Amino acid sequence: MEAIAKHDFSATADDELSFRKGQILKILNMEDDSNWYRAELDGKEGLIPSNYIEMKNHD
Secondary structure (H helix, E strand, C coil): CEEEECCCECCCCCCECCECCCCEEEECCCCCCCCEEEEEECCEEEEEEHHHEECCCCC
16 A cells, blocks of 8 residues: 655664655555565665554545
8 A cells, every 4th residue: 555654764673764754655565464564665665664654645
């Protein structure tokens, strides 16, 4: 699916992804279903926190 950054996030270990409020993060990982997920932004993929991605558009 698609998501949006509610707050700012700066990566610590491995390959995490940084983001800021108002930003649009893409959800395209697998079926882990947990706290770490894989996203895509500006043609780049990575891992982000599920609680750090909100929802927008649609409605």
